[PDB]
Structures are given as structure tokens and as C-alpha cells.
């Protein structure tokens, strides 16, 4: 998080304000990232916390899982298109939905 | 030495004399200063520059 | 002399920021700690 | 504090929430503190005692508004596609943020809305604005990054910040064009540096602090009103004006302690070109301000009759002319101020 | 996100017998059944809270499924006429499937219970309280802290502090 | 693209107020009617992220509670105006 | 108010003695709907310019985790592979499709 | 599906919104897309909590404010134009069909409903707001709400300043 | 005087703040007896939860009876 310049008691009502880390996945990754921030500052740290940041972001981003579907299924959709998938093929078997 | 030593370079090795002005040219600055802002006072006012020294004093 | 050498070293520590010092930006889990301690309180109080 | 209690009322909710937002840790946080920020000046800014000041308060009002609202949604955008408020790097994500700060604190190309105001203001009303309700989004641009940006409001925070103060006659709108112009000052300033950035704002604050507020005790609104206003002498009509030229900071007026340390910061960056088109500019800043001295600086001009005797406040006079001093010798306490190293 | 090169169980490790049971099946028989096998699923679910990755917890899940299979066997056996009418009445008795509406049922249900295995049903709230147990696993995570030998350090307060060298080093000194 | 399929409604919704807010109307109602609008959409970029987030999502009242109170503000200064001036019409500016 | 306390706590002592039995015939699941799902995506991307499974063209989705760690798959991804009946059959069951 | 048809009811409305330039016209236009929005975060949502509470707050009581202040009528009622009613219902139908065609599930958003959440949840279980609103009054988050308030009694000590110019 | 006063003019407002400070102590009262016993332990305790022995919250668990 951006650094207060000033740091009075008053960031004491808004540093906490809203928290990733609690009760959160992605809040084990925020720890491992923090920790080095604190540790590198924060220009040197946001130099060297490559897969601290990527694993971090993807977590909560989903950007690199999510867009991995997103591919996945329009290529499903792409050789439906081309006719590969017929009325039955065309879906695959469905969860227990007891699952996940 | 022939050799620039950059730690040594710096290194409070001494050799700094304060002048007989070198500590005192502040208080003698800063009371001047407010000295003559309380003549700026009186100026303005069209008072005495001399008068209600203990403006001047404080 | 000097001042040339205390600009060269404000050169390289602003570009590396090693030190904690004018081109340094200190950064603070202080209040992630604090919000994981909060966490941390509530949970063994869950439940009556 | 002008006339009623609730005067230092909004002024205190107005200081918490300023400083909310620059001790504020997130963005989120940040625009908290400038809402309230939005609401505490409203009132103090929309007198209900004349016309102007209404009018003036819309258009506050109908800006800061649109300025929070994008503001706010840009960081949400930045810390989604980001997730993290330091992003790695400025993208367009970032440039919005930007462009909300710069029309807050009104940069170059977003001011217009900014002179208008003037003719609504009272002095320190004016002078509140002017000081004050440039912090905030000064100090959050300085998070932001952007080099090019910034360098383009720099390029602009003079043109036309001193272009139009040659053709203003209202002091309102002086006020505005000579700031727009010390604006671009901070803003490069801010782009090389924070520390100085906090001194020159200061010694700006001192200067204009000083400045409009002789120009509530005496009244003085319009070019004509300072040639007509009665002194007793004509020759503190002279020493007093001494500080319209300590806005364009020539050494022996304390204005020059900021500009130099600024200068000599930034050529230290070695953006040459910029200083020169800065610096230029500030002459033609300085050139409106000898307009306005020819008031003073001459002696024994022709005037009015009916006056005869001029008359202020203790406490406004009192104050004013300490702060004016020290715009006349400030320089010899260069060793007084050790916050440059 | 799972891969080639990660491990997965069996198909025939995962196929293992299930209980098939109503919500108003489990829910009638759940205190007799909780205190008969509760060893099973304390360590089996306590693996599960302190390590989350369930491929180690399907020996002792499948252990805890038995378990219950079991219990139910000896139900079928004993008291079939009970269990079943203190089902029928715990839900056609209300859409909340509450014990509060059918405990004359349950009483007798209790009593062919008490006839057969000599069981007492547990408290009102046997199971609420917490549950400290023995170790089985014996995988304790290990507790550690990180180390970041380069980190970026300021000046301590012991750091001698000789008094300055040529004044304020500014342009005359001043 | 995520912020295609995800984000971009609520692009869409709030370029179309923004745009609406600079056009032309007899009066300022129109354009405190339009900011609505935005903060309602400003609202649901707010919470499809704070929805990203498992606790922070509360932050809804404190958005809401700032934001109700430049509504009020705005019908405040308004209203004020149309009793100075008899009117708060764009005529008058 | 004891009464109320009374009852439900012996809904929650009730609660804890099911739970496991349905974490249980859960976890078998979860690990064999997950074997499917990987053979899937191996045999629908068969021609595909760089296809990696689990990952995007290579580098992997998740590295800071060690090697054998197992990521739950968001919920769209381990329904990757299927119909809108089945989808509505468990996330539209607060809304009651 | 309700999801992306009521992006679609949604994006009408909008079009209907920077048409409309009758006050009241507005002011109801804002009255559904509140309706729309409150229907449309609580799909995403843990659960309607907040929904049911921005109703109250921003449409039952706020925009109260509006259509009252915005009764200056025109002077004269509205003369409805049954065209862009029907190119509403026009627009609509086939954005509706084009829903009915969309991929059902990729063109869903994918936050996590509580139904979402996946069953070994033990957090879960408990009452849809406990967890969520833990820390608007648990330290050291809590003060912030002592700032609402405070700021909502500052709000109404400037409208009686603002709304008291002499009457 | 200002007693009778008030209790003659606006006796809703007298009873009810009488009302308000009757709860508030109460509620101080609430919340000491609540540490008497520690409050924290609580008997009954939400979700499934489980101690290895010998952990210091196993240390501490309530053995009474509700």
C-alpha cells in the first residue's frame, strides 16, 4: 500500500482500513508479499518480488486462471463451430453436484 | 596522500575552527531581526520606534 | 572534493534505494498485522 | 474564522479530513478524506450573505464532485486490473488518477473553472482555497508517477497562468493566474522531489497568506482601488508593496529562497529545457506585478479627496506586517532553515 | 490448475462404499452415532483443519465412512420399527427437521436402544463443546520464519555520530 | 478479456453519464440527476471488487454514507439558489 | 431464552456430528471429478499451437507453491466442461432455480 | 437468463435515460435502474443484505429528495412517445434472444455466491452478515463508523447553513 | 424548580431517560459479570473445533457443564 508521507496518528483510522489478508487465500500470499516490502521498501521490493507479486495477483486476480478458461472453452465452442462436435460430444459430463 | 580515500575524505579528521562569529551570528540574527520587526511595528502604527520596549524585549 | 563525492553516492543510493535514508519509502505491515491480530481475536471467540 | 462560530467549526471538520488524505494509506482512504474535505469548504465558500458567493458554489461543487467520482473510479480500476494500490508500473490505468488530482487542485489545462471563482470568493475565502485545497491532491500526485504528464501541466501551468494575469483588472482573478503559474512551479517540483516540494509550497503559503490577507483588511479589489487607497505617508504605500515583487522571488525579497532551491534541484535532474520555459514565464509573472506597483513605487500621485484618515484592525494589521518584514530581509536567515540537506 | 506432473489417488482408492442416506436418515440417527465413532473423525478431520491438501486425509476418510456404515448396520439389525418411525416422524413432522416436535419418538426410540446396546444418548450438547484429543497423525506443520539476509538497512542509534565536518558543507558554509 | 466480458458494462454505463453530465438542460437538475446515475454505477464498480474481497465488502455503507451526502449537498446549494434568485435556472450563468 | 438456547445448540451438537461424514463422501469427489476434468482438457486441446494443461503456454498459473500442492480450481473452471443445467443445479440453489 | 437480461434491462433503461429530458422523466428513469442495480449486485453478492440496505438509504429515502425538489412539473405533464417505448421493447427483444443465445455460462460473472463456495467451508455455516460485517464495529476498524455518524451530524450542521439564507 | 419542572413538561423524556440509565448500568453490570467467568472460553463453540493435547486453548478448554 502507498506509503502515508506524513504517517500521524490519523493513518491510524484508514491504514487498517480495509485488509486483503484476513480469512482470504490470497492473504497468505499477501503476507509473503508484504513481508518483503517491508523488507526491500518499497521501490527495491516492488523490483524483487516477482513471483511474490504474480502469485499474489493471481490469487485474487484470477486474471491467468480465468483467461486460461475463457480460451478453453471457446475452443471448445471453435471446433463445434468447425463441426468436430456433434448434438451429444458437443458437452462433456456433468459434476456431482455434491462436488466443489 | 596519493590515494583518494573516500572514506577518509570525509571522515570529521577535524581542522574547523568556529569562529568568534560562527556560533553567535544566529542569536544575532534572529534578535535583530525581531528587534527591528517591532520598530516595523510602531512605524506602521505611528507610534514611538522607541516606544513599548517590552515589545521589543520579548 | 567532498560535496562531489556526496553527490556521486546520493547518485548510486537513489538508484539502488538500498539505504533507509532520503530515497528510501518505507513501507509498513504494521496494520495488516494488526487486522491479522483482529482476525486472530474473533475466531476463538466465535460462537456461544 | 470571518464572522460566525460555525466558521471555525468547518474549518476543524475540514482539517480532519485533509489530513485524512494525506495520512491516508489507500486510495479508497484518500478519497474519503477528500469528500470531507468537499463538504466542510462548501459552506464557508457559499456565504449566504451575497450573490457571488452562491454561484461560486455550484461550480465548486458540480467540479470537485466529477473530480472525486473519477477519481475514485479510476483507483478501482488501477487496484483491480493491478490488485495491489502500487501498481508495477504507470499505465493508462494511472493517467485518470492523474487527471482527476490536476483538476482538483486546478493544473494547467484543467482550470478554467478556477478564475471564475475568484469573482464569487472573498479574500480569505479565496485565500483558503488557494492555500489549502491545493495540499491534498498535490501530495497524492505526488504518488502518482507519470513523468510526461506532470511535464505537460509544467508546460502549461505558466503560459497561460501568467498570459491571462496580464489582462486581469479584478484581483480575484490575479490571484488565480499568478498561483496557476507558482502552481507549475510545485508541480515540477514535486516531480523532482518531495522535500523541497514541501518547503517551496510552504514559503508560497507564507507569501500568499501574507499577500490577500492585507488585501481583506484594507478592501483593496480592483487596480483602481490600490492607485486610490489613502495612506498617510505614500512611503508604507512603498514598503508594504515590497512583497508584490517577493512573488516573483528577485533575491532580496525571501521569494527567491524557494525558486532557487527548486532550481537548483531540478537542473540537478538536468531537465534544462523546462527551467528555461518556467523561468521564463515567471518575468512575464513578474511583469504584472510591476503593473500593479506602479501604485506605489513612484510617490505622491493625484487621488482622491473625500478621504482623509484610513483606519484597519489591530489583530489583521498586527500580524500582517511581522509576516511582511520578513518578506523584506528574510534571506540573512539562510542558516536558519537546515531542512535542504 | 492441477497438471500432469501432480499426483492424484486411484479410481479405485476413491471407490469406496457411501452411506446413501436421507438428511432425515443421518439426522435421526445422529447422537447415538456421533459418540460411537467420533475417534474417526477427530483425527480425520483434524488432519483435514491443520493441512488442507485431502490427498493424505482419504485413508482415515475412508476409515470414518466405514465407521458409520457400521453403526447403521447394527441399527438395521436391532431396532429397525424405532429408527425408522422417529425418522418418518422428525421430517414429515415439520420442514425445519427439528427434534423439538417428535420426542415421544425419540423416548422410545431411546428405549430399544437402551434394550439392545445399553447406550445413553449424550447430552444436549455433547458434541458442541470443543474437541482436544491424542495425536494419530503425528504431522505437526512446521513453525518458521523468514529471512531476508539483503534487506535494506538505516543508521542504529549506536552508530557513532561525530559532530558535523565543514559546518552546513553548503555553498560560504552558510 | 476479462475486464471485456466483466468490467465493461460498467465502463459503458458510466462514459454514457459522464457525457450526459456536459450535455445541455434547461437546468442544473438534469446534471445532479446525471451524477446519480454515476454513483449508482460508481456503486457497482465498487462492489463487483469489493465482492473480489471475502470481509472488505462493508465498505458499501461508508461509499454510500459519503455519497448520499453530496447528493444532499448538491440539492442543498440548489435549492438555496432558487430562493436567492427566484430561480436556479442556467439562464442565470 | 434458554429454551431457544437450548434447542439450538442441540441443532449445532447435532451439526457437528453429520458434518464429516458429508466432508468425507465429499473429498472422493472432488478428486475423481478432478482426474476427468484433467483428462479433458488434455484430449480437447489435443491440437493446440502450445497447449499446456494446468498452466498458460508453459510458465505456471501458481509458483510460490511447492511442487505436489493442490489448487482448488475456481468454480468455472471445474465446471470447464459443462452444461447450464448442471451449472444452475448448485450455484442457483439460494435462488431456487 | 436473469443475469444478462437484466444487464439488458439495464443498458435500456440507460438508452431511455440520455434520451429523457422531462425532470420527472429522469427522476423515474433513476427510480428502476435502482431497482435494476440492488436486483443485479445482489446476484454477485454473499447475499441481498447490502442490496435490501442501499434500497432504503438511496432510492426510499434519497431520491425522495429529488422528485420532490424536481416537482417543478415543467409546468405540464409528460407527452409520452410510444416510439422509443417500442424501440425499447424492439432493443430489448433482441438483446433478449441474443441472451438466450450467449454462452450460458462464460458470459456469468464468477464471484463466489454463497452457494459458490465450495462445501468444506467450515466459515460458511454461519449466519449470511456475522463474518461479513465482523469488523465495521470490532477495533480498530470500528471508529470509522464513529466518523460516519459524526460526519452525518457535521452534514446537517451545514445544510441548516446552506439552507438558511435568511428564510 | 427544574426537577418537578421537567417531570411536569415532558414526562415521556423524564421517564424514558430514567429508562436509558437504568440500562446502561445494567449493562456495565453485563459486562463485568461477563469477565467474571472469563467470557471467552465460551462452552459452546461455532464450526467443528479441535485441539491436538497439550495446546495451550486445549490447555484451557471449559470441563463444566454448560
Redesign the interface.
Known amino acids: 500500500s502507498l506509503t502515508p508521507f506524513l504517517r500521524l496518528p490519523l493513518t491510524d483510522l484508514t491504514g487498517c482500513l480495509i485488509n486483503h489478508q484476513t480469512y482470504d487465500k490470497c492473504g497468505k500470499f499477501e503476507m509473503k508479499m508484504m513481508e518483503c516490502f517491508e523488507a526491500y521498501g518499497l521501490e527495491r521490493g516492488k523490483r524483487e518480488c516477482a513471483d511474490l507479486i504474480s502469485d499474489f495477483q493471481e490469487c485474487v486476480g484470477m486474471q491467468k486462471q480465468l483467461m486460461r478458461f475463457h480460451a478453453m472453452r471457446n475452443e471448445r465452442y471453435k471446433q463445434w463451430l468447425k463441426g468436430e462436435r456433434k448434438g451429444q460430444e458437443f458437452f462433456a459430463d456433468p459434476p456431482r453436484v455434491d462436488a466443489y | 596522500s596519493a590515494v583518494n580515500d573516500p572514506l577518509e575524505l570525509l571522515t570529521n579528521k577535524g581542522t574547523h575552527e568556529p569562529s568568534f562569529l560562527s556560533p553567535i551570528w544566529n542569536p544575532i540574527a534572529c534578535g535583530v531581526a525581531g528587534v527591528g520587526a517591532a520598530i516595523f511595528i510602531n512605524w506602521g502604527f505611528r507610534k514611538p520606534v522607541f516606544s513599548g520596549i517590552q515589545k521589543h524585549i520579548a | 572534493?567532498?560535496?562531489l563525492?556526496?553527490?556521486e553516492v546520493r547518485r548510486k543510493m537513489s538508484e539502488?534505494?538500498?539505504?533507509?535514508?532520503?530515497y528510501?519509502?518505507?513501507?509498513?505491515?504494521?496494520?495488516?498485522r494488526?487486522?491479522?491480530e483482529?482476525?486472530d481475536?474473533?475466531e476463538?471467540?466465535?460462537?456461544? | 474564522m470571518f464572522n460566525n462560530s460555525s466558521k471555525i467549526l468547518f474549518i476543524t471538520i475540514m482539517i480532519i479530513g485533509t489530513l485524512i488524505t494525506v495520512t491516508s494509506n489507500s486510495w479508497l482512504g484518500a478519497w474519503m478524506g477528500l469528500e470531507i474535505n468537499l463538504l466542510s469548504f462548501i459552506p464557508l465558500l457559499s456565504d449566504n450573505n451575497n450573490l457571488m458567493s452562491t454561484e461560486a458554489s455550484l461550480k465548486y461543487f458540480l467540479t470537485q464532485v466529477l473530480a472525486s467520482t473519477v477519481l475514485l473510479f479510476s483507483s478501482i480500476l488501477l487496484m483491480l486490473k493491478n490488485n495491489m494500490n502500487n501498481e508495477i508500473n504507470e499505465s493508462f490505468t494511472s493517467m485518470i488518477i492523474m487527471s482527476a488530482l490536476l483538476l482538483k487542485s486546478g493544473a494547467a489545462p484543467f482550470h478554467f473553472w478556477f478564475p471564475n471563482m475568484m469573482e464569487g470568493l472573498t479574500w480569505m475565502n479565496a485565500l483558503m482555497l488557494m492555500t489549502w485545497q491545493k495540499i491534498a491532491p498535490l501530495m497524492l500526485i505526488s504518488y502518482l508517477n507519470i513523468k510526461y504528464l506532470l511535464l505537460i501541466s509544467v508546460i502549461l501551468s505558466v503560459i497561460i497562468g501568467a498570459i491571462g494575469g496580464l489582462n486581469q483588472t479584478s484581483l480575484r482573478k490575479l490571484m488565480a493566474f499568478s498561483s496557476i503559474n507558482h502552481l507549475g512551479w510545485m508541480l515540477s517540483s514535486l516531480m523532482i522531489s518531495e522535500s523541497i516540494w514541501l518547503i517551496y509550497f510552504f514559503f508560497y503559503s507564507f507569501l500568499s497568506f501574507v499577500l490577500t490577507f492585507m488585501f481583506n483588511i484594507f478592501k483593496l479589489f480592483h487596480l483602481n482601488q490600490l492607485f486610490s487607497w489613502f495612506v498617510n505617508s505614500k512611503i508604507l504605500k512603498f514598503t508594504l508593496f515590497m512583497n508584490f515583487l517577493s512573488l516573483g522571488g528577485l533575491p532580496p525579497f525571501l521569494g527567491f529562497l524557494p525558486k532557487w532551491l527548486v532550481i537548483q534541484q531540478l537542473t540537478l535532474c538536468n531537465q534544462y529545457f523546462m527551467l528555461t520555459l518556467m523561468m521564463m514565464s515567471t518575468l512575464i509573472t513578474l511583469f504584472f506585478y510591476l503593473r500593479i506597483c506602479y501604485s506605489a513605487f513612484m510617490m505622491n500621485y493625484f487621488e482622491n479627496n473625500w478621504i482623509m484618515k484610513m483606519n484597519m484592525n489591530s489583530i489583521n494589521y498586527n500580524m500582517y506586517m511581522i509576516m511582511t518584514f520578513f518578506s523584506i530581509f528574510g534571506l540573512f536567515l539562510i542558516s536558519l532553515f537546515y531542512f535542504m540537506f | 490448475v492441477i497438471t500432469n506432473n501432480t499426483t492424484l489417488p486411484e479410481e479405485s482408492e476413491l471407490n469406496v462404499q457411501e452411506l446413501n442416506l436421507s438428511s432425515a436418515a443421518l439426522r435421526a440417527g445422529a447422537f447415538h452415532l456421533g459418540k460411537q465413532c467420533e475417534q474417526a473423525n477427530n483425527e480425520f478431520m483434524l488432519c483435514r483443519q491443520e493441512l488442507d491438501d485431502p490427498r493424505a486425509c482419504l485413508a482415515e476418510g475412508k476409515a470414518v465412512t466405514s465407521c458409520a456404515l457400521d453403526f447403521f448396520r447394527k441399527v438395521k439389525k436391532t431396532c429397525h420399527e424405532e429408527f425408522t418411525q422417529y425418522a418418518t416422524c422428525l421430517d414429515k413432522s415439520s420442514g425445519t427437521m427439528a427434534f423439538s416436535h417428535c420426542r415421544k419418538t425419540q423416548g422410545v426410540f431411546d428405549k430399544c436402544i437402551k434394550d439392545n446396546f445399553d447406550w445413553d444418548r449424550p447430552s444436549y450438547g455433547y458434541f458442541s463443546r470443543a474437541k482436544v484429543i491424542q495425536s494419530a497423525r503425528e504431522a505437526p506443520k512446521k513453525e518458521e520464519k523468514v529471512s531476508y539476509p539483503d534487506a535494506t538497512p538505516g543508521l542504529p542509534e549506536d552508530y557513532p555520530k561525530p559532530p558535523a565536518k565543514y559546518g552546513s558543507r553548503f555553498h560560504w558554509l552558510e | 478479456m476479462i475486464m471485456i466480458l466483466y468490467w465493461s458494462l460498467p465502463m459503458i454505463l458510466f462514459i454514457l453519464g459522464l457525457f450526459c453530465f456536459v450535455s445541455n438542460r434547461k437546468h442544473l437538475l438534469s446534471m445532479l440527476l446525471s451524477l446519480e446515475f454515476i454513483v449508482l454505477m460508481l456503486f457497482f464498480m465498487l462492489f463487483i471488487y469489493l465482492n473480489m474481497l471475502n470481509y472488505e465488502s462493508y465498505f458499501s455503507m461508508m461509499f454510500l454514507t459519503f455519497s448520499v451526502c453530496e447528493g444532499a449537498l448538491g440539492l442543498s446549494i440548489l435549492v438555496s439558489m432558487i430562493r436567492t434568485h427566484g430561480n436556479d435556472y442556467f439562464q442565470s450563468f | 431464552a434458554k429454551k431457544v438456547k437450548r434447542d439450538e445448540i442441540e441443532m449445532r451438537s447435532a451439526q457437528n456430528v453429520i458434518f464429516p461424514i458429508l466432508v468425507a463422501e465429499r473429498d472422493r469427489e472432488f478428486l475423481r471429478q478432478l482426474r476427468r476434468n484433467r483428462d479433458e482438457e488434455a484430449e480437447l486441446m489435443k491440437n493446440v499451437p502450445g497447449w499446456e494443461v494446468g498452466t498458460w503456454y508453459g510458465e505456471p498459473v501458481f509458483k510460490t507453491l511447492p511442487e505436489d500442492t493442490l489448487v482448488t480450481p475456481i468454480f468455472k473452471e471445474f465446471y470447464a466442461h459443462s452444461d447450464w443445467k448442471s451449472y444452475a443445479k448448485r450455484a442457483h440453489l439460494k435462488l431456487w432455480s | 437468463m436473469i443475469q444478462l437480461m437484466l444487464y439488458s434491462l439495464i443498458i435500456t433503461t440507460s438508452i431511455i435515460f440520455l434520451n429523457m429530458i422531462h425532470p420527472l422523466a429522469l427522476g423515474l428513469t433513476l427510480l428502476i435502474q435502482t431497482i435494476f442495480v440492488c436486483l443485479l449486485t445482489g446476484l454477485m453478492t454473499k447475499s441481498f443484505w447490502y442490496s435490501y440496505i442501499l434500497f432504503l438509504i438511496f432510492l426510499g429515502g434519497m431520491l425522495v429528495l429529488f422528485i420532490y425538489v424536481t416537482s417543478l412539473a415543467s409546468n405540464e405533464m409528460f407527452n409520452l412517445s410510444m416510439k422509443l417505448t417500442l424501440f425499447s421493447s424492439l432493443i430489448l427483444i433482441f438483446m433478449l434472444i441474443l441472451s438466450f443465445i450467449m454462452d450460458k455460462t462464460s458470459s456469468s460473472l464468477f464471484l463466489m455466491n454463497n452457494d459458490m463456495q465450495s462445501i468444506i467451508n467450515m466459515n460458511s455455516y454461519f449466519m449470511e452478515n456475522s463474518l461479513s460485517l465482523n469488523k465495521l464495529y470490532n477495533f480498530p476498524t470500528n471508529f470509522i463508523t464513529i466518523l460516519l455518524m459524526n460526519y452525518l451530524l457535521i452534514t446537517l450542521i451545514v445544510i441548516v447553513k446552506i439552507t438558511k439564507l435568511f428564510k | 424548580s427544574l426537577l418537578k419542572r421537567a417531570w411536569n413538561e415532558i414526562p415521556d423524556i423524564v421517564g424514558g431517560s430514567a429508562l436509558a440509565l437504568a440500562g446502561i448500568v445494567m449493562a456495565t453490570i453485563g459486562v463485568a459479570n461477563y469477565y467474571a467467568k472469563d467470557g471467552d472460553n465460551r462452552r459452546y463453540k461455532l464450526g467443528y473445533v479441535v485441539y491436538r493435547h497439550d495446546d495451550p486453548r486445549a490447555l484451557k478448554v471449559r470441563n463444566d457443564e454448560d
Open positions: 572534493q567532498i560535496r563525492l556526496e553527490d539502488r534505494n538500498d539505504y533507509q535514508a532520503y528510501y519509502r518505507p513501507s509498513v505491515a504494521k496494520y495488516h494488526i487486522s491479522k483482529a482476525a481475536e474473533l476463538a471467540l466465535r460462537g456461544d
